[PDB]
Amino acid sequence: GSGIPFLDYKVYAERIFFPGHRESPLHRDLGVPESRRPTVEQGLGQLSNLLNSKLFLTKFIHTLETQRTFSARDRAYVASLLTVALHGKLEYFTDILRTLLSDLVAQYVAKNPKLMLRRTETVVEKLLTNWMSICLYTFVRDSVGEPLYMLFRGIKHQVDKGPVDSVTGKAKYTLNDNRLLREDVEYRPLTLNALLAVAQGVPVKVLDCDTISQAKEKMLDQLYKGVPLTQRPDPRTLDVEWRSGVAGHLILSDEDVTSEVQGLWRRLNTLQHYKVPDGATVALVPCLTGIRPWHLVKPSDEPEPPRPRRGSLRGGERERAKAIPEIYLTRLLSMKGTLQKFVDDLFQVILSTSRPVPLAVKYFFDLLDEQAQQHGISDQDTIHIWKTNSLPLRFWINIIKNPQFVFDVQTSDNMDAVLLVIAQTFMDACTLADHKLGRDSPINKLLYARDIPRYKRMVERYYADIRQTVPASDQEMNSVLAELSWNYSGDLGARVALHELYKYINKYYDQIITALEEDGTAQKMQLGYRLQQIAAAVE
Amino acid sequence: MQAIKCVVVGDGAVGKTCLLISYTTNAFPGEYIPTVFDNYSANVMVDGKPVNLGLWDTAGQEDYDRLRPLSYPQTDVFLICFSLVSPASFENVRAKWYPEVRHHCPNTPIILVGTKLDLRDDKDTIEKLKEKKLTPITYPQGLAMAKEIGAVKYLECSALTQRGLKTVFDEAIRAVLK
Ligand SMILES: Nc1nc2c(ncn2[C@@H]2O[C@H](COP(=O)(O)OP(=O)(O)NP(=O)(O)O)[C@@H](O)[C@H]2O)c(=O)[nH]1
Ligand SMILES: [Mg+2]
């Protein structure tokens, strides 16, 4: 098994910095004419130098976060814009993070400190996610990528061993009770002799119940084994060509003249439909150009919602949540057992203490211990949550939920469903809440009931063993941060990031100007006049 | 150059595969293996014009009925084959082959081909049919079927001897031209 499709730092960062964009918003043309091009670029250049002022930047973020119009979406976006702009100055970026974290600790000490860093609704929260991502890229590439890819390929291999409905998405092998194919459909495995006419034959293990598209997907995974998704061609551009005897010439598809149509239903064409036998030569050739569809089980569209009773409380548990029948639970528990080796390996690597712990993890956990100490927080559970809502529930969980942040792969609805159960188990391992179990309890808790206590002990010993080792100084950390800045060549969209940052300055100009004029040190530094010069240069 | 698509349809073991091998390689196969969807190619001159004739062999088995219409799109000429000795294959033209071809291609010409011409006059073949109470298909019997199915031309040929075989594919190209 040679070839792990790791994303290049640029793609890794862009996907993590802008999760709700599909494509980085920083990769576009300014939209400013060539006449205003020298004057605007000079103004943006002066803004980059103004961002290096700690007093300015801190007052800039604080002013924005006090505004009603500046939403959570804005807060996360602005944090990513500052990350790209200050990627070359990671030592300074961390100093800004530290300052903003101290402001956050102070706020939460006077309210409930167990609620700190729970979500991503502030600038400092998103900055921490980006900070962790930057430092941990090598760690993910060097140590966490191997078990994570093993789990991904592991699920893909096991799910492929049984039927999957192309329409509903229901599979024979899954971890979610809602995605389980309750009816056991008639299926037989077939080993196809695959050819790539874009040549030598490659054996591909498929099932007679697979649709032409499902067969094509399984074919491409073997014909492009150690090939990333970007290098792989589009499936719509390729046709499935079945060939027998001396010359075949027959094109198979999901919908054609051969399709089974009875009433308002249309069955999708399978390999069993065309009567394709085991050992049949199937090639991939390029494409040269009402009635409801179904595949294995007909979709059950029920007009289920009735009008509720007056006094009735309904509840999303106890009555609606019927205990999973042993027949279906055994099928889910069998699936859990198959992926156990991969799950255990992944959680062991993430929470490894005998293996070297990244300095970023050590340093930030030492900072959280120091922040709790300065504010008199002795409650260990509060400190546990703080560390949990920095790094496992901020970084790790998202990487498990979505492998597309780290790898260049495609993810099916059932693949996402299985990974979610695994990710929820990882969340329960870091959570301090004790669950008794029973009936309406979540699927992940029922499946990983025998493993969660051991995982909880792994997280407990992870924070403890990190604490016992010599504290990490700023001098020790900013050395790694300096080399992290030098290691990356550039072209992340810093020029466009400065333009997008000015749009927020233009939006809240009068508000920012007051913060820069109310402060005595800011008046002596002339930060207000500096911001005016940039505002005049752009417009 | 003008390429012509040709699809050969008919009942199980009538002689479709044999008819195509005997015309392309000029040799009879002998060994019986039921074909699924074989393809053959031969360049033949008809009326002083070059033609790259594309031959498509189909399965005669009712089990392979599902995959059969995939050969039908963009076809120039059809060849409905029936055994001259087997009267069941002749009856299957009206009941199975003719309505199937017209359902997918209603404007494509059809030529009725009477396979196994050498076995029609053979003494040993008639004795086997006499005991089964069946009579071989004569020329006016087959011609009446070709008129009923709206076929452009009716030809009788034998793959083993090559009699009429060269004319079958020659008249096939002629139907496309007009
Ligand atoms: N004497 C004689 N025998 C023939 C002739 N044509 C076919 N046969 C014999 O009859 C059998 C059928 O041959 P075949 O071409 O495979 O018929 P087919 O219709 O293509 N089979 P399928 O329907 O499964 O595609 C073979 O045993 C063959 O040797 C013929 O013209 N003369
Ligand atoms: Mg045949």
Residue numbers in the entry:
A (entry chain X): 1560 to 1757, 1764 to 1854, 1880 to 2129
B (entry chain A): 1 to 178
Task: Give sentences from the paper.
Plexins constitute a large family of semaphorin receptors that mediate the repulsive chemotactic response necessary for axon guidance in the developing nervous system. There are four classes of Plexins (A, B, C, and D). Their architecture is conserved across the family with a large extracellular region including the ligand binding sema domain, a single transmembrane spanning helix, and an intracellular region that transduces signals to a number of downstream pathways. Plexins are transmembrane receptors distinguished by their ability to interact directly with small GTPases of the Ras and Rho family through their intracellular region. They consist of two domains, the GTPase activating protein (GAP) domain, first identified by sequence similarity to RasGAP, and the RhoGTPase binding domain (RBD).
We have determined the crystal structure of Plexin-B1Δ1 in complex with Rac1* to a resolution of 3.2 Å and refined it to a crystallographic R-factor of 20.7% (Rfree = 23.8%). The overall structures of Plexin-B1Δ1 and Rac1* in the complex are very similar to their apo-structures with rmsd values of 1.5 Å and 0.6 Å, respectively. However, there is some flexibility between the Plexin-B1 GAP and the RBD with the RBD being rotated by ∼6° compared to the apo-structure. The hydrophobic interaction between Plexin-B1Δ1 and Rac1* is extended by two potential hydrogen bonds formed between the sidechain of Asp38Rac and the backbone amides of Val1811Plex and Ala1812Plex. For the one-to-one complex, Rac1* is positioned distant from the Ras binding site on the Plexin-B1Δ1 molecule.
